[PDB]
Amino acid sequence: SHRKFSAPRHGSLGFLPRKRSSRHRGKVKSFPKDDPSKPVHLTAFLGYKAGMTHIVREVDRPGSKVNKKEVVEAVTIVETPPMVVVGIVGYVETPRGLRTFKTVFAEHISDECKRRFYKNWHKSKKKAFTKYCKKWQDDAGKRQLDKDFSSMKKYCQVIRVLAHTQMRLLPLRQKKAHLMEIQVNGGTVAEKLDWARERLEQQVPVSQVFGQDEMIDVIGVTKGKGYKGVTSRWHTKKLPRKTHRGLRKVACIGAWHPARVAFSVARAGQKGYHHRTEINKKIYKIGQGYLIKDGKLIKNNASTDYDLSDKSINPLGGFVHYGEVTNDFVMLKGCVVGTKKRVLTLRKSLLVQTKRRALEKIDLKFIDTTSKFGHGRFQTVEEKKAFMGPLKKD
Amino acid sequence: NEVVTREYTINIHKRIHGVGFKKRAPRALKEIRKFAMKEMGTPDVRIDTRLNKAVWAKGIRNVPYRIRVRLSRKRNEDEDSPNKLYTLVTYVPVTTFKNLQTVNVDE
Amino acid sequence: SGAKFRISLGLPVGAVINCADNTGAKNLYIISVKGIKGRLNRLPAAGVGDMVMATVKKGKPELRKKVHPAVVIRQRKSYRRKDGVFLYFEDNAGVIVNNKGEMKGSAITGPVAKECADLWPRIASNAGSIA
Amino acid sequence: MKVELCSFSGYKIYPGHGRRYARTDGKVFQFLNAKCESAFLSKRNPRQINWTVLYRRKHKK
RNA sequence: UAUCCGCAGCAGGUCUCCAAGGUGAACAGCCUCUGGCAUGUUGGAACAAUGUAGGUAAGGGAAGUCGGCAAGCCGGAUCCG
RNA sequence: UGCUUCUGGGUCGGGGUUUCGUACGUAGCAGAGCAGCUGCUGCGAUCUAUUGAAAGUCAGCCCUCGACACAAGGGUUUGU
Ligand SMILES: [Mg+2]
Ligand SMILES: [Mg+2]
Ligand SMILES: [Mg+2]
Ligand SMILES: [Mg+2]
Ligand SMILES: [Mg+2]
Ligand SMILES: [Mg+2]
Ligand SMILES: [Mg+2]
Ligand SMILES: [Mg+2]
Ligand SMILES: [Mg+2]
Ligand SMILES: [Mg+2]
Ligand SMILES: [Mg+2]
Ligand SMILES: [Mg+2]
């Protein structure tokens, strides 16, 4: 007989293979589509999650209850040093899909990227690309190289540049860099190839990829949570207290006559550490890193034009479990996937965005930098000491 | 070079944080032995009864947060034993664990 | 014009709240909350500024044993104003109105939440204090 | 944004933190955190608790 | 809780004597001395799900359920009543 | 994920942060009062000063560039 009282499904079947990700960093499943009209540029970049923070701004949307009021909005900090480019890959489109035509690497590759090529760097003799790098200083090697470039120019359709992160500019424990392919979008294949090969082997910052007050997509792996039951992986209702053989279960696993149990019935297993992507995450700020000039270290990242203090983005005691954000960073709205210290892919929006909340201009008024390692009361150490006075230890 | 005595302070709070009440002192001894065999390169570590009493002084679930110990690596007297060197671990009663570096105490 | 945002609602069906007016009632017993679509095994609950159906459990006889429309004035559950503050009152209290927002009494004892005062202009006029 | 003072400890409350508590007789208070909240609800005099500002100012510390 | 009966070194059963200190109305419960013992037919490493035995939960307060089942509230003494 | 660019991680120590709430001792003509000796000496819960003090703080917090030792090792396989 039928289910007497209807009720919607628990969970979504669109994320069904609810298994551990085969990858640690998110892979861009689809890059933004190309058009030759726009100038050439990049479409994705890679950062690291640091922590979350308060923000105070003034809303500007007519007809709202909070028009020209001031609201607080949680934000996510993604520390993001400039990448460095090490290679170019061309793709040719086929009736069977899209296959790699040819790959060209740079003359000099840092040990940061070399570490990615070994699963035991301590024991290795570090021979990656040692015989390849001689193709660059040889006349025959370089003429074969430009033959490769011309072949890519006249046979390939989409161009992806290889870039890796700089792990020595981060407080993280690992020294093995992250390597990625980023699609070059813009003009024709010749222009894209010239652009990629004229800044091959050098650095690319974040402000050249993403602009302030823009809505992007975030890709990454969620937090792992181990083996979990149906009542927490699928959020089914708990059974009453009187149940004999356990109450954190789902009672009916299926009807009789379909003599199997379907793919759609909630079962216990791995929760979290899945690969996810979230769309429409808006950028409030692109802050530069600590820099040096005249022997004085300028650091006032979190300084707004309504505050005029010299506090940096780092709260007192640093970001918990992560460290200190000394180089460039971006500030997205809300929460992103993944835990602290997690690598995190950022990409341009796919769909065109013409809507009011997509075209609001963001002007910040206050950035809270109280200690997150407990209930913090003071924004800066100077403020703390001025309020408290001299201590015994002083 | 081989026969040598040094002294350290051990953060038992850190090394046994998170364990059950009835297993704290035994794991305190296990962690002390592991620390001794990691510092002095020998698998044979023996602990004085005075140090055992010091670790067990406050009971089974309340253990001192830090202990000052002396590690003495010395050659094994019983020649037929496979191990050439052993490490005696002794208790050092202190008043404050402040600014106490590891000290190369000499003979 | 501007609509009310979502708030941390904390008054399910069956909640008994105080009556902050001079109509003669002393308790409201919430029987249902207007505007609720519902879900399986999901108690319809009301936040501040919401209009509910209630009944009087203690009060003068002529206004007992029947259903009255009411508006929730204060709640003990702390709710988040979009300014970033979390506000909660000492008691859960409401007033009895008609179907179109006119209040049956003439004065309100105690403060009135800003959301309710904005949504119901007749409640705000008789509200002595606010927020 | 304006910065307001904790009704119990006298500390300085920033926009994101704290809670605000209105009584039946009006007289809205604001509290920095749940420690101050619980002390206020338990009806303790701030002049007697060492870590607040009223105590420090009345003892000239 | 191993010399008896129960197929067994079986959480069952099997008639009596003696009986310290403190708290406390008390041979109640809790801590100790005389006397006894080695955790009850094994140990080591971790701390997933589901369990068994305990706890705590904002706002509401039986709306749950056949049914307040279960848990929770109350608790001693003195003075009123 | 890490495992010699005098570099590295590791331990300990030191700062930052943060939790609770003002330590022991000493001094007080502060202290309901009581005892003794002719104002002093004793008992006395509590209070005041030293004292936002003392204690804890990554084991899954943040920086150290202080001290100490250690790290160029071991084993099993893989051929176009
Ligand atoms: Mg149906
Ligand atoms: Mg049963
Ligand atoms: Mg925190
Ligand atoms: Mg139902
Ligand atoms: Mg046992
Ligand atoms: Mg045993
Ligand atoms: Mg036995
Ligand atoms: Mg509750
Ligand atoms: Mg409650
Ligand atoms: Mg019923
Ligand atoms: Mg029912
Ligand atoms: Mg019962």
Curated annotation (Swiss-Prot), chain A:
It comes from the Eukaryota. There is a cross-link at residues 38, 223, 225, 285, 365, 385, 392 (Glycyl lysine isopeptide (Lys-Gly) (interchain with G-Cter in SUMO2)). The modification Phosphoserine is found at residues 12, 303. Constitutively monomethylated at His-244 by METTL18. Methylation at His-244 regulates translation elongation by slowing ribosome traversal on tyrosine codons: slower elongation provides enough time for proper folding of synthesized proteins and prevents cellular aggregation of tyrosine-rich proteins. It is not required for incorporation of RPL3 into ribosomes. There is a cross-link at residue 293 (Glycyl lysine isopeptide (Lys-Gly) (interchain with G-Cter in SUMO1)). GO terms for molecular function: RNA binding; structural constituent of ribosome. One of its GO terms (cellular component) is cytosolic large ribosomal subunit. Keywords: Acetylation, Cytoplasm, Isopeptide bond, Methylation, Nucleus, Phosphoprotein, Ribonucleoprotein, Ribosomal protein, Ubl conjugation. Component of the large ribosomal subunit. The ribosome is a large ribonucleoprotein complex responsible for the synthesis of proteins in the cell. This is Large ribosomal subunit protein uL3. The gene is RPL3.
UniProtKB/Swiss-Prot annotation, chain B:
The modification Phosphoserine is found at residue 81. One of its GO terms (biological process) is cytoplasmic translation. It holds the Pfam family Ribosomal_L31e. It comes from the Eukaryota. Keywords: Acetylation, Cytoplasm, Phosphoprotein, Ribonucleoprotein, Ribosomal protein. Gene3D superfamilies: 3.10.440.10. One of its GO terms (cellular component) is cytosolic large ribosomal subunit. It is found in: Cytoplasm. The modification N6-acetyllysine is found at residue 58. GO terms for molecular function: structural constituent of ribosome. The modification N6-succinyllysine is found at residues 38, 53, 58. Belongs to the eukaryotic ribosomal protein eL31 family. Component of the large ribosomal subunit. Component of the large ribosomal subunit. The ribosome is a large ribonucleoprotein complex responsible for the synthesis of proteins in the cell. This is Large ribosomal subunit protein eL31. It comes from Oryctolagus cuniculus.
UniProtKB/Swiss-Prot annotation, chain C:
The keyword Transmembrane helix does not apply. It comes from the Eukaryota. The modification Phosphoserine is found at residue 8. One of its GO terms (molecular function) is large ribosomal subunit rRNA binding. One of its GO terms (biological process) is translation. InterPro entries: Ribosomal_uL14, Ribosomal_uL14_CS, Ribosomal_uL14_sf. Keywords: Cytoplasm, Phosphoprotein, Ribonucleoprotein, Ribosomal protein. PROSITE patterns: RIBOSOMAL_L14. It is found in: Cytoplasm. The keyword Ribosomal protein applies. GO terms for cellular component: cytosolic large ribosomal subunit. The modification Phosphotyrosine is found at residue 29. Coiled coil: none annotated. Its main location: cytoplasm. Belongs to the universal ribosomal protein uL14 family. Component of the large ribosomal subunit. The ribosome is a large ribonucleoprotein complex responsible for the synthesis of proteins in the cell. This is Large ribosomal subunit protein uL14. It comes from Oryctolagus cuniculus (Rabbit). The lineage of its organism: Eukaryota, Metazoa, Chordata, Craniata, Vertebrata.
Swiss-Prot record, chain D:
Mono-ADP-ribosylation at Glu-4 by PARP16 inhibits polysome assembly and mRNA loading, thereby inhibiting protein translation. There is a cross-link at residues 2, 27, 35 (Glycyl lysine isopeptide (Lys-Gly) (interchain with G-Cter in SUMO2)). The modification ADP-ribosyl glutamic acid is found at residue 4. It is found in: Cytoplasm. Belongs to the eukaryotic ribosomal protein eL24 family. Component of the large ribosomal subunit. The ribosome is a large ribonucleoprotein complex responsible for the synthesis of proteins in the cell. This is Large ribosomal subunit protein eL24.
